[PDB]
Each structure stands twice: as C-alpha cells, then as structure tokens.
Amino acid sequence: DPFGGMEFVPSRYRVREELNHPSLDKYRIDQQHITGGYSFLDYISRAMFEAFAGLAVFIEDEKEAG
C-alpha cells in the first residue's frame, strides 16, 4: 500500500471530469493561471469534499451522547 493506509476515498460523492462551473471559465483561459500551473481540478476536489464533509455528522446528538 503506497499511501500508508491513509488514502482518502470519498463515500457519498465522486469527483468526475464533467464537473465545472461557469465562474471557472474566466480563469481557465487566463494566461497566468494556465502558464503558472494553477490546478482547477484541485479546486473542484476541494469544493466537493467540503460540500459533503460531515453530512451525517450530527453534532447535537453525538456530543450529548458523551
């Protein structure tokens, strides 16, 4: 196992190639973003994680149970 048992594999979502947002289109064609190496895939992956991270984390019930 190359990731030392730490590989993150999302459960309720999947980051596929078809994901895009028109607000990104302005930057994808910005010379500085492309020639400079800005990763739009990482941004999409960052948004999708935060959109689902802790969706079934019930703060009230979990904290009162301790």
Partner: protein
C-alpha cells in the same frame, strides 16, 4: 461511517467548537456567572452595580457581530476573512464574558487576526488606517488575548466553497434549468454571508449541513434533489433531512434582510443603548483597557520584584 465525515470529526471546529444548544447555553451562563463573581470580589477592595443578563450579554455579541461584518464589507475584505473574523469573535465571547473585555475593541482584533488566519498579513498601520484608528497599538493589545480565547484553533471551515461544489453536482442533472441554478446560488450565497454568522449555526451544524440549509431556503427543490440523489445511489437519509430542517429553521430567524435591523438607529437607541449603559458601570476595571492590561503584564514578566515607581 462515511470517510469524509470521519476526517471532519478530527478538526478543531468539531472537537473544540461544536456543542449542543444545551451545552452552549450552560457555557455562556457559567461564563457570565463566573465573571459576575470575579468582578464582584474585586469591587469590594459598598453598592454593587447591575450586571448584564446572559441574554443581554448574547444580545450585544449579536449586535457587534453584525457591526463586524459591516466593517468588513466597507473594507472590501474577502468572504472567507469576514466569516473567520466573525467566528473568532463569537468564539472569544463564549469562553469570555462581555463584562471582562471590551467588545468594541475585540471587534477590530477579530478582523485583524482573521486576515492572518486566512493568509493575509497586513501592516497594522495600514489596517488601522482603513478603520480610522489613530493608534494601532490599541488593536495589537488584544491579538494574543483573542488567540487564547479561541483556544488556538485557527482552522475555521466555511460553507462558501461547499456551495459552489454543490452547484456543480446539480449542473450534471439534465432536467434542472441553468437560470434556476444561478438564482439559487446567488441567493444561497447572500444567506451564507449573514445568516449563519449572526446565529449559532456553526456550533450545531457542519458546513455541508449549513450549506444545504442556505440552499434549501433559496430553492427547497434543489436541496431535496441533491440529498435524494446521493442516498438513492435509508434511515440516515431521514436523519440528515431532519438535521438540515433544524438548521433551516435556525437560519430563517436572521435572514439577510435583517442587515438593516441591526444598523437601525431606532433599534440601537431602544434595544442596544440601554445595555451599553448597564455594561459601562459593571465592567472589569483592570482588563477593560487592553493597552494597560498589556503594559502591566509585560512589566510583570520583565521586572519580578524590582521597582522604583511604586508609591503605595
């Protein structure tokens, strides 16, 4: 047992700054009661003043959290900075009472430290310029104090980027209309920019939960669609929907339209000003002046028992 949920529970936001509404009230009440006892003991060294009620204490925090956001808007700060500064402010005054440290000053400190926490390290002189503050040292005096108050937890998680992520998942559906999607995102963003920062949303709900709630208020159809799809492909689905609905109701009580309520001159004079006067006569005499609090704590650490200015 989602893997993205497990990773979230390792954040400081969950282990340190996530509680139940019953836990939140008890902390705030005990912080006020302890502050009441601490200030009372000091005064004797004999008519005591009227101390603020926990609800009146929480009312000023809400008023100054809205003023903090307004201040951020005028300074054209990023949404992530505003949300972080506001959260630091709310977190500071749950471990600390308003009768101990001045909220008028901690407001500026939370904005200055919020910048740093989000990768913006401006010059204190330039920061003081934008807020018409003549002496910048008045702001620095509370920086380290704020850091302790928020318990050194600088990683705050916001739902703004989560919103743009949720829109892309919806854009893959062919039945949904783009113009409908744009309107939902536009409104949900304004909701996220105010509603969960002025209420206790962060303490009881996850950025995904809050994000879906703001979208549910903007377009309930889209929010229900997104939740149905992911669980389609159980009992947990109903428990998540119930949680979002609980968050949906909490947010509705302080929608973006309320921005004018907390900036109203009549609301201020009638509801806020009385409280500020009650606070002006029962505040902590030694800690209210941050610059002096800092002065004596620096001199106490340098000079242990050496002194040549004491007259008794």
């Amino acid at each position: 047992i989602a893997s993205e949920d497990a990773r979230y529970r390792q954040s400081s936001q969950y282990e340190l700054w996530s509680f139940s509404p019953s836990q939140l009230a008890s902390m705030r009440e005990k912080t006020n009661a302890a502050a009441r006892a601490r200030i009372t003991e000091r005064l004797l060294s004999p008519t005591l003043p009227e101390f603020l009620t926990p609800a009146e204490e929480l009312l000023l925090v809400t008023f100054y959290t809205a003023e903090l956001l307004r201040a951020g808007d005028h300074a054209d700060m990023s949404d992530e900075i505003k949300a972080t500064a506001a959260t630091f402010f709310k977190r500071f005054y749950i471990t600390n009472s308003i009768m101990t440290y001045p909220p008028q000053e901690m407001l500026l400190v939370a904005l200055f430290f919020g910048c740093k926490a989000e990768g913006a390290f401006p010059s204190i002189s330039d920061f003081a310029k934008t807020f018409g503050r003549e002496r910048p040292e008045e702001i620095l005096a509370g920086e380290f104090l704020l850091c302790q108050g928020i318990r050194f937890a600088l990683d705050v998680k916001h739902p703004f980027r989560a919103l743009r992520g949720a829109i892309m998942e919806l854009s893959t559906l062919p039945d949904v209309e783009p113009a409908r999607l744009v309107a939902a995102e536009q409104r949900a963003r304004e909701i996220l920019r105010f509603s969960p920062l002025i209420t206790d949303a962060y303490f009881h709900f996850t950025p995904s939960q809050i994000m879906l709630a703001a979208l549910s208020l903007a377009d309930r159809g889209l929010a229900e669609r997104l939740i149905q799809d992911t669980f389609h492909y159980s009992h947990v689905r109903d428990k998540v929907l119930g949680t979002i609905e609980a968050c949906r109701d909490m947010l509705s009580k302080e929608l973006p339209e309320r921005r004018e309520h907390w900036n109203n001159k009549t609301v201020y004079k009638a509801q806020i000003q009385p409280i500020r006067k009650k606070l002006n006569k029962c505040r902590d005499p030694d800690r209210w002046n941050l610059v002096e609090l800092q002065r004596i704590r620096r001199e106490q650490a340098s000079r242990k028992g050496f002194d040549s200015d004491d007259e008794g």
